[PDB]
């Protein structure tokens, strides 16, 4: 899976 935040 993949995730990010900013």
Residue numbers in the entry: 1 to 6
Pull verbatim passages from the article behind this deposition.
Curli proteins are produced via dedicated and tightly regulated cellular processes, and their fibrils mediate host cell adhesion and invasion, lead to immune system activation, and scaffold bacterial communities known as biofilms. The two key players in curli fibril formation are CsgA and CsgB, the major and minor curli subunits, respectively. CsgA, a 151-residue protein, consists of five imperfect sequence repeats (R1-R5), defined by regularly spaced serine (Ser), glutamine (Gln) and asparagine (Asn) residues. The first and the last repeats (R1 and R5) form amyloid fibrils in isolation and are critical to CsgA seeding and nucleation by CsgB, while the other repeats (R2-R4) contain 'gatekeeper' residues that temper the amyloidogenicity of CsgA.
129TASNSS134 was selected as a control sequence as it was computationally predicted to be amyloidogenic but is located in a region not implicated in fibrillation. However, while 45LNIYQY50 (R1), 47IYQYGG52 (R1), and 137VTQVGF142 (R5) formed unbranched and elongated amyloid-like fibrils, the 129TASNSS134 (R4-R5 loop) segment formed scarce and more amorphous structures. The 129TASNSS134 segment from the R4-R5 loop did not bind ThT. Unlike the three spine segments that adopted tightly packed steric zipper architectures, 129TASNSS134 adopted an anti-parallel β-sheet structure lacking a dry interface between mated sheets. The packing of the β-sheets most closely resembled a class 8 steric zipper, with a truncated interface between the two facing β-sheets. In contrast, 129TASNSS134 does not contain any residues that have been shown to act as sequence determinants of CsgA fibrillation, and moreover, Ser133 is nonessential for fibrillation. Furthermore, in agreement with its atypical crystal structure, 129TASNSS134 formed scarce and more amorphous structures, and did not bind ThT. These observations demonstrated that not all segments that are predicted to have high aggregation propensities actually form steric zippers. The R1 segment 47IYQYGG52 and the control segment 129TASNSS134 showed a milder effect on the fibrillation rate of Aβ1–40.
